[PDB]
Design a protein around this nucleic acid. Structure first.
Lengths: 46, 177, 24, 148, 424, 53
RNA sequence: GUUUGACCUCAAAUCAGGUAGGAGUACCCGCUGAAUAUCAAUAAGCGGAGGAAAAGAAACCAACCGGGAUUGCCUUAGUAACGCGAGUGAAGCGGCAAAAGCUCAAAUUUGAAAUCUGGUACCUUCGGUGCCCGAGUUGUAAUUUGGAGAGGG
RNA sequence: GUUCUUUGUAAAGUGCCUUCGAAGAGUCGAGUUGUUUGGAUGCAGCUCUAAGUGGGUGGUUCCAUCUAAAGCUAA
RNA sequence: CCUUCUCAAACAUUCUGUUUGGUAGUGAGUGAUACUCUUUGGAGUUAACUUGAAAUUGCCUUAAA
């Protein structure tokens, strides 16, 4: 039998909250106009 | 975590595996200068529990001291004198033999912006912490100073010289008691 | 703790016996 | 001539099975910093339901946390770790837990497949391909544990 | 009669009404007034007759009337041999305590010792305990409030005698206070040793009150779940009652099957507890997942099959219940006992009765690995099943060492045995 | 304190798909991306209803 | 492969960004230290800091119906104790001044090294942002420092 | 006070139920040799070297109190 | 140590229905009697079940150095 304890946290069965936080931070940056989406970067590559 | 396994293994110091490791490491160090920069600590558990962290700003130094002012105190003083721009935080034993005893000391550079902006480590940047080993403020220095609580340290609880001055002074008030 | 006891037993088996322990 | 707990290294997986294991592990390369950053930026732009990702486990502390839980199915151990005490007990821990383990020469080679300069250990918990993993585990067992 | 006809406190009557109970059973009616008067009692009240509430009501009334704070004693201690019966009693008591501020707790052998020890520091006034753990608790639980002992009672004296706790019960009673504390006990039957224990424990003069083919299947511990599921599918839409070791396992299995099968256990609310039984009885096609204690609560209605999946709480009780059912019904419900290949020693008990005998996964693994609630329910059911196996008396027939935890976990859908603090 | 626009949309989706069936809403695998408890779901839905309807 | 790459180690550059000596010294800290008990943890010497330094939140004091960081004063007290000889000499409790608790090692973020140094262009410049470079996996962030604490409802 | 912003299914607290629940080794300690104390303690070269319901400090069977071998912190 | 034969025609007018042809397989193992033929020289078919891709001998060189 395994020796450990502290049964599995919900985050292991749920999408990471850190990913959501990073996505929302990037969304805020885009709203502020300080981040260019990669699709727009492709156009600006001209 | 694995660090518990490392601590348990290090508990059995006289194990044949640790004997081989120590005799290999001492021989390897015998071909290096007395004091030299260490790429990484050889006892990660001890350094981690002593406050060392693997981030830009920390430095590990290995120093060799003649066997037979404690040996750890001498090592700390030597590393501080050589590493004038770094502050000695703590040190731990790593090897010994019939001729020499080896200790590892971890140092933090207060000039690096990483340490300066580290809320948990920027305290060492204060000028009052300069040359901690010089004043015996390190763990070994404090232990050698007899600083502790209880009857066993009444005469050396905080300052062996201070108590002598206090008991030798003549306090006289404006109105004599 | 059961985990601590298991780790201690594992370390005991790995490290063998000390030179002074081997005298027994 | 060294204590038996030492010299368990220098006996390692053969070239063919080691190459097969490396090829299998390369499939589950974790998303590097650049790839993860660009994917997150793309997701944010799209925002401005999801499957669980699969990747190899390489952190020594994280691997040891997964080990002794019996979740790890196959673990790779580097034989050139300077603090040998970090890995002397890992083979014994895996044997006690019944988790197959393979010693692969070169910590740098182990780390090259996980976007890191060096990596002491690597372990797999989830799989995409289960038959291939089982066959590799059986081959590694028959070629390493039954021989040494 | 009805509980409202007595001088019971308003919160107690409100709790009783919320429980759905309004009429008083014969044992309850006979015992409630004398016990509220503070007189001791002993009787052969069989399990499921309602003696639990009959004893609890006077004790809860005394707790309410005294108003003593948790720091001023230990309130009521209820010793129960079986873990399942202890859990059922605690659940029943919780219904009344829902309207009471007094603290309630449990001390069950096999549970986390540290948790119970820490809980004992809060001065629990409604405690359900087991004889085995009490010795160690009193030998090591420093600071445990143990002097007030408002009321101390025992249950299932026959099972305690069979287990052999009498040696521990003597020491527990000797350490227990010997003061105005009310003393009682109940059992399915009265015997010499039970009467001696009553005399030792009852200070005043007690207010005495009184009130076939066997089928089995041999299946591995891992295949048991799949075998049962296949048998139910082949016999689906029928009326069948399944007996399980623990309420948590019952809930887990019911939830898994619902993801056409009902549930009935002592952990569910009493109103729903009776509603589920009534619905199963009147459905003509319902399937019930329940435990032995809940089944003993009321006579089993006419059924087509009695699939005793988990081991019974008391082999003698089940052996007598099957015979009683065979006589009280014409369409006898075929019994389906499950015996582990390493548990074949039970055949001696079956033969002693002389009755005739007969010898009649990835889809859920992914769901467990993807659903947190289902995984938690499965883990709780596995833990409760292992604890129930630990809390047994036929140590020669049933042994944890004879069970492979990996196979049990596979039966429960876990790839690896989940952690359990069993005293192996 | 209020609820975010994305949070409001997520709440509205679940409310439309299951109404007040909290138990059914809990098991929605492709709308309940985060396995929120019944209590949290009902509290958030009540807050949304009070704020909007 | 009668080759080409991953690292690790070791050197160098008028490399870029940084710090170290020394002075002063009444007080502070450490080492050393005279004219077997006494002048003495003094005189002198060396090293290391600030406006204060050290110490600091007990493996404490007590044997009480217990107190609860460190520090200074009175008291304890010229008492206990010792060298019982000349002589040295405490500390708890009590009252007063001022009061503040915290941070790591330890059990998986693994459903996302989420951390940080530096370069570059701007702005609202004791800093912030987009990008890049490097450190980090032999552990950088959050979550816990026994007063417990952690996964869930 | 004055003015712009928050948000993100973000972070904490209260009571209850539930499942778990780590703790500084060449370190403590004993031996010996130098050193300090009016304290017999502590400091220091070196042989050995401890355990986890364990360890340290105190007395008549033990009972009272903490959890050392890391560090920061104004008055 | 790579990796698998991804529609042709006619009519159709329905936001497209029907026909033809197009389906050339890891092995071993178990299996309770039905359609056949050369009728001794053993061959083609017919429910059902197990499986680690399991197993003892049926008489064109830049995927380069």
């Amino acid at each position: 039998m395994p020796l450990t304890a502290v049964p599995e946290p919900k985050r292991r069965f749920v999408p990471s909250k850190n990913e959501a936080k990073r996505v929302m931070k990037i969304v805020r940056a885009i709203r502020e106009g300080r981040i260019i989406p990669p699709k727009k970067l492709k156009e600006m590559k001209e | 975590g694995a660090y518990k396994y490392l601590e348990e293994l290090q508990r059995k110091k006289q194990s044949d595996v640790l004997r081989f490791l120590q005799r290999v490491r001492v021989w390897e160090y015998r071909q290096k200068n007395v004091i030299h920069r260490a790429a990484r600590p050889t006892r990660p558990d001890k350094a981690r529990r002593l406050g060392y962290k693997a981030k830009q700003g920390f430095v590990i130094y290995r120093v060799r001291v003649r066997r037979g002012r404690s040996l750890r105190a001498t090592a700390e003083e030597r590393v501080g004198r050589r590493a004038a721009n770094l502050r000695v935080l703590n040190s731990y034993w790593v090897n010994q033999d019939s001729t020499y005893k080896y200790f590892e000391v971890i140092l933090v550079d207060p000039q690096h912006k990483a340490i300066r902006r580290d809320a948990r480590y920027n305290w060492i940047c204060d000028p009052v912490h300069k040359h901690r080993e010089a004043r015996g403020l390190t763990a070994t220095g404090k232990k050698s100073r007899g600083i502790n609580k209880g009857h066993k340290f009444n005469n050396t609880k905080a300052g062996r010289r201070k108590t002598w001055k206090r008991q030798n002074t003549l306090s006289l008030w404006r109105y004599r008691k | 703790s059961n985990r601590t006891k298991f780790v201690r037993s594992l370390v005991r088996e790995i490290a063998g016996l000390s030179p002074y322990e081997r005298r027994l | 001539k060294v204590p038996p707990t030492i010299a368990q290294f220098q006996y390692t997986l053969d070239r063919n099975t080691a190459a097969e294991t490396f090829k299998l592990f390369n499939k589950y390369r974790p998303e590097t910093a650049a790839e993860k950053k660009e994917r997150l930026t793309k997701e944010a732009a799209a925002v401005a339901a999801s499957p669980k990702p699969y990747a190899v486990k390489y952190g020594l502390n994280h691997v040891v946390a997964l080990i002794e839980n019996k979740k790890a199915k196959l673990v790779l151990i580097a034989n050139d770790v300077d603090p040998i005490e970090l890995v002397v007990f890992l083979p014994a821990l895996c044997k006690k837990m019944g988790v197959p383990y393979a010693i692969v020469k070169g910590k740098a080679r182990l780390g090259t497949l996980v976007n890191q300069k060096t990596s002491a250990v690597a372990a797999l918990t989830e799989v995409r391909d289960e038959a291939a993993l089982a066959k590799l585990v059986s081959t590694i067992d028959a070629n390493f544990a039954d021989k040494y | 009669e009805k509980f409202e006809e007595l001088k019971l406190s308003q919160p107690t009557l409100k709790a009783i009404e919320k429980m759905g109970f309004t009429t008083m059973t014969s044992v309850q009616a006979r015992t409630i007034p004398p016990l509220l008067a503070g007189r001791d009692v002993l009787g052969a009240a069989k399990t499921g007759s309602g003696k639990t509430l009959a004893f609890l009501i006077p004790a809860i009334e005394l707790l309410h009337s005294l108003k003593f704070k948790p720091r001023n004693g230990t309130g009521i201690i209820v010793i129960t041999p079986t873990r399942e019966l202890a859990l059922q009693i605690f659940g029943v008591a919780r219904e009344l305590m829902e309207f009471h501020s007094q603290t309630f707790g449990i001390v069950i052998g096999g549970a986390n010792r540290r948790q119970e020890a820490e809980k004992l520091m809060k001065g629990v006034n409604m405690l359900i305990a087991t004889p085995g753990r009490l010795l160690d608790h009193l030998q090591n639980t420093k600071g445990f409030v143990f002097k007030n002992l408002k009321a101390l009672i025992i249950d299932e004296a026959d099972r305690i005698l069979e287990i052999g706790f009498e040696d521990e019960m003597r020491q527990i009673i000797k350490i227990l206070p010997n003061e105005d504390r009310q003393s009682m006990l109940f059992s399915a039957t009265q015997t010499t040793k039970v009467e001696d224990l009553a005399r030792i424990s009852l200070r005043p003069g007690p207010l005495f009150i009184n009130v076939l083919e066997q089928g089995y299947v041999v299946c591995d511990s891992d295949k048991r779940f799949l075998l049962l599921f296949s048998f139910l599918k082949r016999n689906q839409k029928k009326k069948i009652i399944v007996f399980l070791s623990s309420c948590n396992s019952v809930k887990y299995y019911a939830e898994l099957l619902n993801y056409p099968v009902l549930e009935l256990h002592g952990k569910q609310k009493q109103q729903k507890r009776t509603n589920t039984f009534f619905e199963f009885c009147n459905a003509e096609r319902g399937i019930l997942i329940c435990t032995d204690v809940a089944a003993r609560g009321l006579d089993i209605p006419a059924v087509d099959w009695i699939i005793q999946f988990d081991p019974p709480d008391d082999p003698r009780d089940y052996i007598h219940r099957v015979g009683r059912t065979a006589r009280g019904t014409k369409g006898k419900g075929k019994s389906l006992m499950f015996l582990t290949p390493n548990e074949l020693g039970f055949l001696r008990y079956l033969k002693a009765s002389k009755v005739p005998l007969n010898e009649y996964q990835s889809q859920l693994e992914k769901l467990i690995k993807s659903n947190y609630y289902l995984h938690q329910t499965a883990k709780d059911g596995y833990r409760s099943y292992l604890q129930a196996y630990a809390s047994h008396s036929l140590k020669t027939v049933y042994q944890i060492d004879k069970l492979d935890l990996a196979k049990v976990a596979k039966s429960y859908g876990f790839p690896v045995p989940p952690k359990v603090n069993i005293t192996i | 304190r209020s609820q975010s626009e994305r949070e409001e949309e997520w709440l509205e989706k679940l409310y439309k798909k299951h109404g007040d069936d909290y138990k059914k809403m809990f098991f929605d695998k492709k709308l309940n991306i985060y396995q929120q408890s019944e209590g949290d779901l009902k509290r958030r839905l009540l807050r949304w209803k009070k704020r909007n309807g």
